[PDB]
Design an enzyme around this catalytic site. Sequence first.
Site, PDB file in Angstrom:
ATOM      1  N   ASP A  25       0.894  -1.292   0.047  1.00 25.95           N
ATOM      2  CA  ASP A  25      -0.107  -0.105   0.071  1.00 25.95           C
ATOM      3  C   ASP A  25       0.837   1.396   0.145  1.00 25.95           C
ATOM      4  O   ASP A  25       1.440   1.695   1.077  1.00 25.95           O
ATOM      5  CB  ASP A  25      -0.950   0.168   1.110  1.00 25.95           C
ATOM      6  CG  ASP A  25      -2.023   1.016   1.070  1.00 25.95           C
ATOM      7  OD1 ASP A  25      -1.988   1.961   0.226  1.00 25.95           O
ATOM      8  OD2 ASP A  25      -2.850   0.928   2.124  1.00 25.95           O
ATOM      9  N   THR A  26       1.119   1.704  -1.266  1.00 23.96           N
ATOM     10  CA  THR A  26       1.925   3.005  -1.193  1.00 23.96           C
ATOM     11  C   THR A  26       0.971   4.552  -0.466  1.00 23.96           C
ATOM     12  O   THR A  26       1.768   5.357  -0.366  1.00 23.96           O
ATOM     13  CB  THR A  26       2.179   3.315  -2.637  1.00 23.96           C
ATOM     14  OG1 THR A  26       0.875   3.655  -3.302  1.00 23.96           O
ATOM     15  CG2 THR A  26       2.990   2.471  -3.343  1.00 23.96           C
ATOM     16  N   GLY A  27      -0.014   4.134  -0.179  1.00 27.60           N
ATOM     17  CA  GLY A  27      -0.865   5.124   0.260  1.00 27.60           C
ATOM     18  C   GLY A  27      -0.859   5.281   1.869  1.00 27.60           C
ATOM     19  O   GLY A  27      -1.354   5.992   2.394  1.00 27.60           O
TER      20      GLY A  27
HETATM   21  C1  G08 Z   1      -6.738   6.704   2.824  1.00 23.09           C
HETATM   22  C2  G08 Z   1      -5.270   6.916   2.717  1.00 23.09           C
HETATM   23  C3  G08 Z   1      -4.834   8.190   2.775  1.00 23.09           C
HETATM   24  C4  G08 Z   1      -4.710   6.148   3.819  1.00 23.09           C
HETATM   25  N1  G08 Z   1      -5.255   4.623   4.224  1.00 23.09           N
HETATM   26  C5  G08 Z   1      -4.350   3.725   3.197  1.00 23.09           C
HETATM   27  C6  G08 Z   1      -5.213   3.265   1.916  1.00 23.09           C
HETATM   28  O1  G08 Z   1      -4.478   2.846   1.002  1.00 23.09           O
HETATM   29  C7  G08 Z   1      -6.618   2.793   2.418  1.00 23.09           C
HETATM   30  C8  G08 Z   1      -5.938   1.036   2.707  1.00 23.09           C
HETATM   31  C9  G08 Z   1      -7.258   0.320   3.094  1.00 23.09           C
HETATM   32  C10 G08 Z   1      -8.256   0.514   4.223  1.00 23.09           C
HETATM   33  C11 G08 Z   1      -9.096  -0.175   4.697  1.00 23.09           C
HETATM   34  C12 G08 Z   1      -9.495  -1.212   3.786  1.00 23.09           C
HETATM   35  C13 G08 Z   1      -8.702  -1.617   2.447  1.00 23.09           C
HETATM   36  C14 G08 Z   1      -7.423  -0.917   2.265  1.00 23.09           C
HETATM   37  N2  G08 Z   1      -7.332   2.391   1.297  1.00 23.09           N
HETATM   38  C15 G08 Z   1      -8.460   2.773   1.200  1.00 23.09           C
HETATM   39  O2  G08 Z   1      -9.098   3.762   1.970  1.00 23.09           O
HETATM   40  O3  G08 Z   1      -9.480   2.681   0.176  1.00 23.09           O
HETATM   41  C16 G08 Z   1     -10.752   2.973  -0.114  1.00 23.09           C
HETATM   42  C17 G08 Z   1     -10.960   3.463  -1.522  1.00 23.09           C
HETATM   43  O4  G08 Z   1     -10.936   2.267  -2.333  1.00 23.09           O
HETATM   44  C18 G08 Z   1     -11.546   1.169  -1.686  1.00 23.09           C
HETATM   45  O5  G08 Z   1     -10.424   0.068  -1.753  1.00 23.09           O
HETATM   46  C19 G08 Z   1     -10.013  -0.270  -0.533  1.00 23.09           C
HETATM   47  C20 G08 Z   1     -10.691   0.588   0.566  1.00 23.09           C
HETATM   48  C21 G08 Z   1     -11.413   1.603  -0.024  1.00 23.09           C
HETATM   49  S1  G08 Z   1      -5.219   4.154   5.487  1.00 23.09           S
HETATM   50  O6  G08 Z   1      -6.238   4.629   6.058  1.00 23.09           O
HETATM   51  O7  G08 Z   1      -5.599   2.611   5.607  1.00 23.09           O
HETATM   52  C22 G08 Z   1      -3.864   4.231   6.229  1.00 23.09           C
HETATM   53  C23 G08 Z   1      -3.944   5.491   7.349  1.00 23.09           C
HETATM   54  C24 G08 Z   1      -2.768   5.919   8.184  1.00 23.09           C
HETATM   55  C25 G08 Z   1      -1.791   4.967   7.846  1.00 23.09           C
HETATM   56  C26 G08 Z   1      -0.564   5.600   8.911  1.00 23.09           C
HETATM   57  N3  G08 Z   1      -0.636   6.305   9.882  1.00 23.09           N
HETATM   58  O8  G08 Z   1       0.313   4.876   8.676  1.00 23.09           O
HETATM   59  C27 G08 Z   1      -1.833   3.920   7.397  1.00 23.09           C
HETATM   60  C28 G08 Z   1      -2.919   3.723   6.347  1.00 23.09           C
END
Ligand code: G08
Lengths: 99, 99
Positions: A25-27
């Site tokens: 997960d690059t995000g």
């Molecule tokens: C929204 C982004 C900006 C940050 N998120 C990473 C995303 O890649 C997050 C990863 C994820 C979370 C839950 C379920 C499946 C995948 N993806 C995500 O929210 O994607 C949304 C949009 O498309 C849909 O497909 C998967 C879930 C839905 S996060 O919320 O998971 C997150 C937040 C903070 C941190 C941190 N502080 O390190 C790590 C991860």
Amino acid sequence: PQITLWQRPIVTIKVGGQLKEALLDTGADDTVLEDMELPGRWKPRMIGGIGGFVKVRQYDQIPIEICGHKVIGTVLVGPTPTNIIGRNLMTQLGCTLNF
Amino acid sequence: PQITLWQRPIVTIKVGGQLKEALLDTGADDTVLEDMELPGRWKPRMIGGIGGFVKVRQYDQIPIEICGHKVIGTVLVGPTPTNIIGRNLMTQLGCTLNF
Ligand SMILES: CC(C)CN(C[C@@H](O)[C@H](Cc1ccccc1)NC(=O)O[C@H]1CO[C@H]2OCC[C@H]21)S(=O)(=O)c1ccc(C(N)=O)cc1
């Protein structure tokens, strides 16, 4: 390897003696794992995403094996709906985004 | 282009006549933008993020310019911490993850 994005880029990891699937997960700044047991001290954090915030425990210097590679780094543990491998570990693999 | 992951992979996109910063997010199935206004009709959608499920507006066939490339696809609009470009559009860019 080269991993396409037609499907979720899911890989097998080994962490805390446990085998599981996780999303590259690059995000994600840091790696976030579904609730599991890990050894050592931890610190409470709140991390925010699309549904709002989740409470996690931050563990430092946790070894994880990802695709036959041993890396080490911060792991956040809490009620995430899915295991996420974040940038903090992907850099250790030499993983890049290419187009 | 090759993008390393030591920092957040942020890019400037042009969408609906506006310039926005967005995160290249391999952990996202879908592209999700903060409240915006886009042309055409929208359809209801619920997505599940790290913190829970959120109601968004689904707009189809939206053109976006990213890193000099024109992609056209589905854009979800709703409360998100950050604009995220998901696999639906990254595949149109020809993005892969590489070791
Ligand atoms: C929204 C982004 C900006 C940050 N998120 C990473 C995303 O890649 C997050 C990863 C994820 C979370 C839950 C379920 C499946 C995948 N993806 C995500 O929210 O994607 C949304 C949009 O498309 C849909 O497909 C998967 C879930 C839905 S996060 O919320 O998971 C997150 C937040 C903070 C941190 C941190 N502080 O390190 C790590 C991860």
